[PDB]
Amino acid sequence: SMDSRTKSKDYCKVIFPYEAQNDDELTIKEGDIVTLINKDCIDVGWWEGELNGRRGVFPDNFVKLLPPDFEKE
């Protein structure tokens, strides 16, 4: 039962579609919401998040970081 138990979290709204080229990547569909878990370093413009129970990496250029007020959990 993979779940999150932390206060310092982050959420992002899928602005555009993006299929994970591999298991290492994460798939996202426009309109959906991805939970930001980590943030790549050498991968400028890429962040690590989770969606539909799938954790991976995706282009930050295809997602919109939610405000500090918007908090699902």
Cα gap 44→14, rounded to integer Å: 18
Provide the experimental method for this PDB entry.
Answer: NMR
Phi, psi of 61 (to 5 degrees): -75, -10
Cα gap 31→48, rounded to integer Å: 18
CA atoms within 13 A on the CB side of 43: 12
**Domains within the chain, CATH numbers bracketed:** 1-73 (2.30.30.40)
Strands, E, within 1-73: which ranges? 10-14, 33-38, 46-51, 54-59, 63-65
Could you tell me if 18 and 32 are in contact, meaning their C-beta atoms sit under 8 angstroms apart? Answer: no
Residue 51, phi-psi category: left (phi > 0), alpha (psi -120 to 50), beta (remainder):
beta
Phi, psi of 42 (to 5 degrees): -70, -10
